[PDB]
């Protein structure tokens, strides 16, 4: 009908009316600096929606194109921009729509699918390009991430899902979604009612560009407003650290970890074997064919039939790790220990591996959260890599590309560090410019020996008390720390006299303890301004926060000046659990990558600890498991 094909030329198609051409002059400035009278085509609802902002918006394609167009992007500050895209993965979908939102000017829209002259979008490649004017973006990661593969390349941005968060100060997990995020802020509706119609078809229908553009356009006003909230509260150090964030992010999403398959298979291979050898050994020893094995209920039953008991002739009633722990003198028990560590190992990795492995490419491709967690300390998901254990056989799997050699570089009590700064301890920094190691410190107070006389035993001990005692647990929960996570078996007066020793000398560690213990503050705050409020006090978590805040701040830093600094080498970066950087870079530049990740990581690291100096290990790795 006439009726739904009223502007089906432009590849517009109607559904419900409420579209109306419309052609007016634009009083642009010209290259030469002149005012020059333009006519342009431009969209328009017929009943106007009761929201205020911007709704007027051009479709660009192969023949509706003008040359003039472009010059709206010249002599700005800042643009709105958003894309659509027909699917969710980056490398089995094609983006639909590109769109700008200038202020005081309609929305400029490219139909991806008909831009078949590569000379249409050079001012979007500009504008994307130059460094001197500000991207608006929300949930910027994914767009950086669809326009990263596609050959576009994007210095500036400023999303405002960072900003949102940043000022919420951590206070809930959900919302931040646009429709929240402006009914908090600008008090207006979206009406955002669709329900993620079609997008692979080419036509379009008027009520999903109406609400795209809207999605686009509302953006600068979000802007206009945000920005200067956030200039009162002093989060402008975070949220610039954070935004240059996303470019490192989007590039090592989309490099990924290839996987020796061959090796896997191997690997697979040897433990399927060492585990049914073991379910063999343990339906020996259970003496039970029909037994479940896996079953929690059947195997206590076993057991209780075995009637396996403790030192103190108690049986078991539960085999929790814990209480595995306490029984470990019966053959039996010991078996079906090590069917837990194998099976639980087996079905954590290996089976569960093959699922993620892209059959195209080869690769595994971690997803990386930045703001999800309330200490800012990156997370992975879908393949989960601070799951992935540290076991060297294992971690083997993971390996370069082809003619390619990794360069892992790491921290190493990069959090300590930061609590030395933080609290101004006198003996901590006194003893770090003398280049010497925390751990050896307490090591030697503890043992009241001189520094070449420590041995690895009382270097563990002090691993373990310095970890303990930093973060003010109380003196008894020491043994179940140093057994839950070394295995340790301190004695309580021995834990006692290491308490009192280590606050003895510490006068810093003491006093910042006192004073946030007295004050029972819900606010904290870290070097970069992070502020975050609890609903009510926690002395862990008070403590807990403004150092691993920190330890964040430094190592999302160094990312950022990594991004930079490898660009003339072309060298990618790759993944980054705890406090690892990992890079890729061909065998012809190894000397020079390895300098440039140290200076980096130095220059991030000195920035804002200003007393203490950090120091970088880097190790010329073949894989991730190397040698340590
Ligand atoms: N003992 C211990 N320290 C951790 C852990 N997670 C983080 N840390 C802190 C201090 C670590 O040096 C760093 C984690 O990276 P590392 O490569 O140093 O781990 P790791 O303690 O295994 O180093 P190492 O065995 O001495 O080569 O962040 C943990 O799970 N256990």
Redesign the pocket.
Known sequence: DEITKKYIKDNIINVDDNIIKKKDIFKLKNENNEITECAFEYFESKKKFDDDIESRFFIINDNNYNENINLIYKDIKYCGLNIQTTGLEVFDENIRLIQIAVENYPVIIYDMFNINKKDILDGLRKVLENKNIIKIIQNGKFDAKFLLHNNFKIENIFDTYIASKLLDKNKNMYGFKLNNIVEKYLNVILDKQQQNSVWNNSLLNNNQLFYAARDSSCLLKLYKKLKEEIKKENLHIVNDIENKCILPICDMELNGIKVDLENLQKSTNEILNELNIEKDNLKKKLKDENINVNSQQQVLKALQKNNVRDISNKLIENTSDSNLKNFLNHEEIISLRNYRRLYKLYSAFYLKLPLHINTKTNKIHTTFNQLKTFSGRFSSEKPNLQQIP?QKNIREIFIPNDNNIFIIA??????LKIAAEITNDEIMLKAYNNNIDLHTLTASIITKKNIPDINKEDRHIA?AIN?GLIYGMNYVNLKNYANT??GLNMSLDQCLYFYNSFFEHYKGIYKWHNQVKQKRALQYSTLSNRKVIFPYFSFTKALNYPVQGTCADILKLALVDLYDNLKDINGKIILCV???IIIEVNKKFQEEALKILVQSMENSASYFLKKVKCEVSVKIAENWGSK?
Not at 410 to 415: H, N, R
């Open positions: 540290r790491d921290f190493k009590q990069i959090e691993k970890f996570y070394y705890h406090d690892e340590d």
